[PDB]
Amino acid sequence: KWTYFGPDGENSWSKKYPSCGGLLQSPIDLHSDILQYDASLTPLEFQGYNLSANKQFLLTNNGHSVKLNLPSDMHIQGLQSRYSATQLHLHWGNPNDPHGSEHTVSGQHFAAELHIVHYNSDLYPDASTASNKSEGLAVLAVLIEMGSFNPSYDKIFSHLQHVKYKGQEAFVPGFNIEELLPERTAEYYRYRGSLTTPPCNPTVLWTVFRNPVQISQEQLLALETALYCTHMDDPSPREMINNFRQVQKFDERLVYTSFSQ
Amino acid sequence: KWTYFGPDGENSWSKKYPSCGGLLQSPIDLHSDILQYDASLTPLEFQGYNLSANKQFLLTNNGHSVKLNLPSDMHIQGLQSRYSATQLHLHWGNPNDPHGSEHTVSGQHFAAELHIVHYNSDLYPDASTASNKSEGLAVLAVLIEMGSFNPSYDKIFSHLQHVKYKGQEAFVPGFNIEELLPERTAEYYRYRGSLTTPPCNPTVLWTVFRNPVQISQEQLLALETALYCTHMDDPSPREMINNFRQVQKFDERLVYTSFS
Numbered sequence: 001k002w003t004y005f006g007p008d009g010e011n012s013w014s015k016k017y018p019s020c021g022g023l024l025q026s027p028i029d030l031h032s033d034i035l036q037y038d039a040s041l042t043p044l045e046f047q048g049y050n051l052s053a054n055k056q057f058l059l060t061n062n063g064h065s066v067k068l069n070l071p072s073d074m075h076i077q078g079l080q081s082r083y084s085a086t087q088l089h090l091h092w093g094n095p096n097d098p099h100g101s102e103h104t105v106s107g108q109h110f111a112a113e114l115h116i117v118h119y120n121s122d123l124y125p126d127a128s129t130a131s132n133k134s135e136g137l138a139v140l141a142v143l144i145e146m147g148s149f150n151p152s153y154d155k156i157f158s159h160l161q162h163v164k165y166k167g168q169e170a171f172v173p174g175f176n177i178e179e180l181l182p183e184r185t186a187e188y189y190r191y192r193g194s195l196t197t198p199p200c201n202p203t204v205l206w207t208v209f210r211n212p213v214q215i216s217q218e219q220l221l222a223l224e225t226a227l228y229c230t231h232m233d234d235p236s237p238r239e240m241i242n243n244f245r246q247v248q249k250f251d252e253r254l255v256y257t258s259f260s261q
Numbered sequence: 262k263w264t265y266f267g268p269d270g271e272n273s274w275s276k277k278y279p280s281c282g283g284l285l286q287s288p289i290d291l292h293s294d295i296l297q298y299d300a301s302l303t304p305l306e307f308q309g310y311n312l313s314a315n316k317q318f319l320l321t322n323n324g325h326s327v328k329l330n331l332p333s334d335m336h337i338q339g340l341q342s343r344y345s346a347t348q349l350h351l352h353w354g355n356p357n358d359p360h361g362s363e364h365t366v367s368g369q370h371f372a373a374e375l376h377i378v379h380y381n382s383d384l385y386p387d388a389s390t391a392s393n394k395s396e397g398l399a400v401l402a403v404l405i406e407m408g409s410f411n412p413s414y415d416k417i418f419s420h421l422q423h424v425k426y427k428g429q430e431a432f433v434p435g436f437n438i439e440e441l442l443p444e445r446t447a448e449y450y451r452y453r454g455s456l457t458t459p460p461c462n463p464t465v466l467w468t469v470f471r472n473p474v475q476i477s478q479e480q481l482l483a484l485e486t487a488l489y490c491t492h493m494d495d496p497s498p499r500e501m502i503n504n505f506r507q508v509q510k511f512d513e514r515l516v517y518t519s520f521s
């Protein structure tokens with residue numbers, strides 16, 4: 001058991017989850033001193049991202065985030081191996097401090113962050129197995145700011161009412177997951193890091209897109225106010241807010257960028 | 262023991278030092294969504310900070326920072342209790358990333374930070390006794406940025422080449438400590454937090470001055486490259502760099518400001 005607040009919060013994760021105290025931890029602050037342009041970072045292609053509206057995908061409150069289960073026929077192409085999707089989920093702040101992305105840029109948080117988790121399906125049968133292995137996982141990170149209403153994000157947010165409490169789940173119809181990606185996906189930061197939640201395994205190839213997507217203030221408030229970290233019958237209900245880890249030390253790492261600036 | 266890098270680094274402190282995973286942890290990011298003006302925050306007076314040039318004070322490389330021992334007649338006036346000085350020390354980054362202040366302001370690190378540690382001498386016999394007790398400690402924090410050469414800071418820095426390894430010590434002729442402070446000490450942030458190193462006791466009244474001081478890039482580079490965490494005889498030396506703790510969550514609480 002672990003949380004983002006109080007005694008079982010992030011400084012205590014390493015007690016039961018020793019990788020959380022190890023090297024190569026995520027997230028990090030992206031700032032000029034540790035960035036280096038790498039022209040070998042070519043564009044990714046997203047395959048199988050247009051999920052059938054006639055199929056259903058499980059949306060779940062796992063007590064730490066809201067997560068949508070994704071099929072293994074969604075793939076990234078462009079890394080050394082092909083990686084297939086397993087799930088996506090979000091991180092956010094709170095109505096009075098609406099700045100809860102995990103990665104920061106030049107010390108500034110965005111409003112929220114989406115993570116789309118993939119695993120090396122060339123080598124491993126599933127994400128559980130891959131999660132233990134070197135470069136077993138690849139995660140795409142989309143930084144979220146306040147802006148215009150985003151119809152594609154509402155294909156998640158409009159369903160939060162059904163998964164208010166920990167352990168609640170609802171099937172939702174497929175939609176085009178590519179619509180959650182920002183413009184100019186060719187522009188990104190790349191580094192070797194970790195899961196940002198326990199067990200914090202240092203097995204993740206990170207791709208953080210340079211350009212944020214926009215969602216409306218009403219959308220963001222819905223995300224920040226709809227969910228609880230606790231079971232429906234828990235006697236000490238806790239809102240699901242500020243579910244992001246603080247940035248970690250660099251540990252001599254550089255972040256490579258597919259752009260110069 | 263404890264370190265700032267590897268398996269004994271800050272995410273592992275709580276395993277041996279459980280207050281590192283408890284309440285009221287420092288340092289924090291000083292931003293507007295958590296600030297609040299409060300009129301009771303009047304100018305601190307710095308008494309006995311003009312150290313006698315006829316005394317000498319011990320500079321030690323403790324393996325985690327460089328620290329100068331201070332005399333207990335040096336004290337802060339203006340708080341509910343009297344706080345008496347025990348030591349000062351610094352925190353910094355590294356040549357590749359020279360931004361290693363502990364506190365940040367609107368997400369921004371400064372180059373380095375100075376901490377002048379005092380103990381509540383009204384309540385407690387010594388710093389040792391005070392550190393884990395109620396209202397035991399008050400720390401002054403000065404944020405350091407690059408700029409003009411600073412002779413005041415050189416009174417310390419000039420000795421760096423003599424304390425390069427863990428457990429090495431050197432003597433420093435008394436000088437005026439108030440020269441290490443910025444101008445306009447009247448403007449400062451104030452909050453209850455913790456030691457930023459193990460055992461992370463939540464017993465510190467922080468004052469972080471609004472205004473930074475300046476040191477030259479030659480001075481900053483000396484600080485970042487002069488010292489080791491390890492003993493001289495060590496097969497695998499470790500440079501003393503990035504000796505700052507990451508900022509902590511600070512939720513539903515308030516930093517009070519003496520200014521607006």
Ligand SMILES: NS(=O)(=O)c1cc(-c2ccccc2)cc(-c2ccccc2)c1
Binds near residue numbers: 087115128131195
């Ligand atoms: N924040 S993340 O991108 O590093 C991440 C990845 C995976 C993950 C999932 C499947 C296989 C492998 C890794 C799970 C989570 C997670 C979020 C909330 C609660 C528990 C776990 C978070």
Ligand SMILES: NS(=O)(=O)c1cc(-c2ccccc2)cc(-c2ccccc2)c1
Binds near residue numbers: 347376398456458
């Ligand atoms: N960074 S700090 O201000 O919160 C701090 C205060 C004190 C401290 C010292 C004496 C009495 C009471 C508190 C000691 C250190 C320290 C730095 C390096 C190694 C070990 C300890 C750090």
Ligand SMILES: [Zn+2]
Binds near residue numbers: 089090091115196
């Ligand atoms: Zn995540």
Ligand SMILES: [Zn+2]
Binds near residue numbers: 352376457
């Ligand atoms: Zn300190």
